[PDB]
Amino acid sequence: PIVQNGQMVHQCISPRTLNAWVKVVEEKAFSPEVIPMFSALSCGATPQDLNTMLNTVGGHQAAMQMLKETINEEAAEWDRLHPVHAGPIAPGQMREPRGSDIAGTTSTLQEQIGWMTHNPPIPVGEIYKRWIILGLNKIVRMYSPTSILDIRQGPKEPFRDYVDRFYKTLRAEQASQEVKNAATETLLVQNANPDCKTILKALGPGATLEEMMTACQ
Amino acid sequence: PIVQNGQMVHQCISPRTLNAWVKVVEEKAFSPEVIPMFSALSCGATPQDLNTMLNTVGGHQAAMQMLKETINEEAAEWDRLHPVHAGPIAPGQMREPRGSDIAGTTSTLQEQIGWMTHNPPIPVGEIYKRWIILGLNKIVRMYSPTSILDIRQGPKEPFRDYVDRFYKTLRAEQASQEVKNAATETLLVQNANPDCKTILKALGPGATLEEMMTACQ
Amino acid sequence: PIVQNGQMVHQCISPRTLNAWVKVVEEKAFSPEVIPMFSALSCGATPQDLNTMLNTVGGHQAAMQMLKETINEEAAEWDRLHPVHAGPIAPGQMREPRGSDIAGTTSTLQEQIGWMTHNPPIPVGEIYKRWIILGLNKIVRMYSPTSILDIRQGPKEPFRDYVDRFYKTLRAEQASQEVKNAATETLLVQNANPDCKTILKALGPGATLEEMMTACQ
Amino acid sequence: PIVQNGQMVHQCISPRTLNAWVKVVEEKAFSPEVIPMFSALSCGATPQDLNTMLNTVGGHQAAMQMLKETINEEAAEWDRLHPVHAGPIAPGQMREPRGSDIAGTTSTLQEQIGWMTHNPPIPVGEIYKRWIILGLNKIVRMYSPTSILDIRQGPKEPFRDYVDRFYKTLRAEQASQEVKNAATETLLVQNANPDCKTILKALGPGATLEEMMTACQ
Amino acid sequence: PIVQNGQMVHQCISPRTLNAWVKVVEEKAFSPEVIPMFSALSCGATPQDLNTMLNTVGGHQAAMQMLKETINEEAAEWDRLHPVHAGPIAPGQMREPRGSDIAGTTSTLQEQIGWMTHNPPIPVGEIYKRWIILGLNKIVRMYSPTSILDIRQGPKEPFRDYVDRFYKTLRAEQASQEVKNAATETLLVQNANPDCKTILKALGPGATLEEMMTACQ
Amino acid sequence: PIVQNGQMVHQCISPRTLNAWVKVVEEKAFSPEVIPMFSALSCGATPQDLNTMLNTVGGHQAAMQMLKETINEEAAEWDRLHPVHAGPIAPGQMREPRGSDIAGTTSTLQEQIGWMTHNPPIPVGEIYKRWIILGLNKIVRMYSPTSILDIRQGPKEPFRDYVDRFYKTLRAEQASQEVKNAATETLLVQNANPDCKTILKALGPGATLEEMMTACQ
Ligand SMILES: COC(=O)Cc1cc(=O)[nH]c2ccccc12
Ligand SMILES: COC(=O)Cc1cc(=O)[nH]c2ccccc12
Ligand SMILES: COC(=O)Cc1cc(=O)[nH]c2ccccc12
Ligand SMILES: COC(=O)Cc1cc(=O)[nH]c2ccccc12
Ligand SMILES: COC(=O)Cc1cc(=O)[nH]c2ccccc12
Ligand SMILES: COC(=O)Cc1cc(=O)[nH]c2ccccc12
After folding, report:
1. Where is region (PPIA/CYPA-binding loop) located (chains A, B, C, D, E, F)?
2. Which of A76, C1, C96, E133 is deepest in the core (most CB within 10 A)?
3. Residue E182 backbone phi and psi in degrees, to 5
């Protein structure tokens, strides 16, 4: 990655970072919590480091191929926004990055450093991570095993356990933060068992999740 | 986080910190000791780092949704206290943070750095951690399985084991430090078994916990 | 903790330190070797770091409550020795610490830093660790399962194994270094089995432990 | 390796790096993901460090012998491109590296440092790693157990599982990124089971992998 | 310990060092290889750090008591060599260390730092480690289970295995490097089985260990 | 070891290095890959550090005694090459190292530092490591269980598995890189099974190992 000692300098990706990423993917596959873990392990990442982390995954090649497809789409839209002059470059001067330069396929580490450490920075690392996360979210959703519609409380299931499944499903199904805030007063109640549902109805509306979990405890 | 090398500079959250947090949550869920562990692992945390740690939790989505609700409440009270001018910002100048800027949802890492490293600091990291801990304590209490009233010494249970359950329950039930200091001379004795209770009564009042544990050893 | 880079600056307590402390307590409870381990893991600790380490212990709440009682006693004796002027403080100036300021309950991290890094230092970290260790030794002794009087050599037990139990018991029972130096020529021999006891008597007095262990090998 | 503290200086290869490399080879042998792992663990590597990592592998001596053969070929082509003057060297001056100097067999660490830290650098580390990776890819391909032609979807096999095997096989068989982009619309469909194949045909052409995986879910 | 950043400054003993020492003692007890491990883990150690490492051992209290006895003897001989003036000390000036100051029982960390960082250094750490190792060697020897005289090659035992037991026993029995160099041509042969003994005799004298192991392979 | 912060300064050998060395010896004994691992773990090692690593090995005392014998031989040849003047040394001046000074038996750490950090360096660490590796290779060869002559392909054994055993045996038997390059066209074929041997003969000469492994796949 790029970090300050100080000044902004390139640092070797650590065995710890490399191992942490591979292990989280081995253990959790594309459970949605893997995404913010990817983001935090890739703190300060050059595009080279981002390729390194993705390339070190041995499984999930279906997913990695879908991710390439997402990255080419984003790359093509970059090149539509920021077309570069095809003429040869000014001696000693910074060339403008292309989609494939951001994706690290046609850029060197040195060019990647040049861009990221420029005043002001061309943040090719951050632009690329954005594309990658956009792609990883598609895969979380694809790999989401269960519709929120099939998350219903078992007659003998503690409410808290039911709500954990519900909001875990909502997260993988990529429901917006609004519909997460809103499903409380709608589908969470409708999908609750009769006993708890009766209690929840009687709370009336405006009931916090904390109050609902209290009520059906 | 933000640390001194020196001067105050941003540092990538470490794989060790990320792994430690996820593991403590996997092993201990919302046992009350998880809170001061969260606090210490989040030493120097930007709001981004605080979101990162919370977002890396894969389970307990019921709890994480309750936490959002706590954070929106605190955020709304911040905005009631410190309303910001809605006009566009002075070129090159620090804008005032809003509730959602402190929660890291509408603020950039750079703005978060600007605030935290300002002279004097606007400690958005520390303000946010406060909100989060307030929220985590609600969840400790919610997840507390047992009323102090049902912590009674078994006829064959060593007093020390009984007292460990008692003060563990009191801690999860969020009893104040006063009522922790006071329950000694009241409920600890009443909830003790007949044999030990007889010994404890005969100590008279003002008996330290050390003296009571000695007495019923 | 506080360390030199250099100059004296505050450093985040490490996940390694946090994990090491919790693990030693999980594995060893209040075996006496846990105390010097606590001392060494808490090298350079602010009172905040000392609270952090104690607060991260999930079990042993009986012990943690006894420790508070020890800390309040020490705190009250501090305040008897070093009463502070109750008037408001000189702008920009260091206030004098109270018992509860040393225990970290009424002091901020910044005040704790101010004191510890002052010329000369007010070593609130070291004063507090002293109180805590005083409290932990009471708990070692309380939790000591066995009187030295019941450490007797089995007829078939190697002398070395008997001496390991004896000096392990003496350590937990908090016997002074004198009585550790002295019990050799008295209780170690009396508690030895007949066979070895006969050999030990015949050594006459002034026999080193090394000579006694040699003699009964 | 060589890193900046600062200035460019030699650093001992870490036990962590050494252990990480040996463990990845023990666990994964020559699965293609081992190559980018080798590349990232060898970040900043001198040729000495590259020999060290390869030499620490205890198994796979067939592969290590093939790798030497690749390295001698590359070395011979270097010497064809950059023949060196056989006359004795200018006192105190940098000699030109030969194929075997790049491979670290006839060069000292100091000469390797001289070259890599020269203005401008002679990047013998990077030139050698290139040769090594060229050699490792031959071995990935050799060790590839299965022709893409024998990756066919089982009648009861989830499409996603079939696609994971397909793109895992394509990767080990070293198929170009074009033929990875292209096999989607050809062999992936032909090798799909009848049920899914019928669905895929009906998508018509231009179907993304994401759409195909959706369609046969 | 004391290290250079730079200049000579005090550093907290690391959790890694603390854990490494306790684990080596748990796994190996007083096998002779534990001594050079103790020496290397205690690199740069103040007497405080040396007490810390010894104090963190939970078992082997027989051994730890023998070690105190060794340390008091060495301490008493120090005080015989370097008696100190009993008069009060020159304000702001370095006092001379006593036996118990070197053993860390009557010295502060600051005094220990003063001595060790003085120009020239009073190396109380190194003087104390010497005493401790002297004491640990007595314990290795005491704890040595087997006389070299009972190391005899089994009729079916590979010579190499016999020699490993022989030189392992010699090491624990603290045989000098001379008698290690010499026992080759004497007791190693006499303690060898008849078959190998016949071969070894026929080598004649001056046979290296390498030649003897070759001969009886 | 000795490293640059910067300037050349002494550093404590790390618990990680100490543990890594002991573990590699516990797991792999004297498999030839242990040697380059020893070399890399001993990067920057003083002779003291080299003694430390060898001394921390608890097993293999037969081997460690053979190693001493190798080191005395090398030491005696050093003293034949570089005899030192037996007169007392120039006050404040660097004495010349003897064989036993290089082996760390008669030299202090400070003298070892003086030599290694001198302008220009007297590289006693590197000279000693050379002696040690020379000695370790003798032991690899001694401990080599199997003649290359007994590495023959089983009728049902994959060629690749046969070649792995062959080149693993060649490595332990310390065959030169020439005879490793050459045995391909000779003994590898002769020791191959009839089926594969027939294929290999028909390749004619000049067949790379890659072509032979392809041919008999
Ligand atoms: C479409 O652009 C790319 O292929 C970027 C890329 C480069 C690389 O080296 N490995 C990847 C792995 C998985 C997804 C993407 C990539
Ligand atoms: C209500 O404000 C938030 O949603 C703050 C927040 C942001 C985020 O990225 N993840 C969270 C996870 C768990 C609770 C909160 C948050
Ligand atoms: C009596 O003073 C205290 O309560 C000090 C203290 C503070 C804290 O945050 N946690 C503790 C845990 C265990 C014993 C003590 C404390
Ligand atoms: C052909 O050039 C080499 O032999 C380079 C080389 C040197 C070394 O020390 N170990 C190796 C291990 C495995 C492949 C190669 C090498
Ligand atoms: C005789 O001098 C000592 O007691 C030195 C010493 C101090 C300490 O704190 N712990 C020890 C543990 C084991 C042997 C010795 C000591
Ligand atoms: C012959 O010279 C030596 O004995 C060098 C040496 C010193 C030491 O402290 N330990 C060793 C262990 C194993 C082989 C050698 C040595």
Report:
1. 83-91
2. C1
3. -95, -40
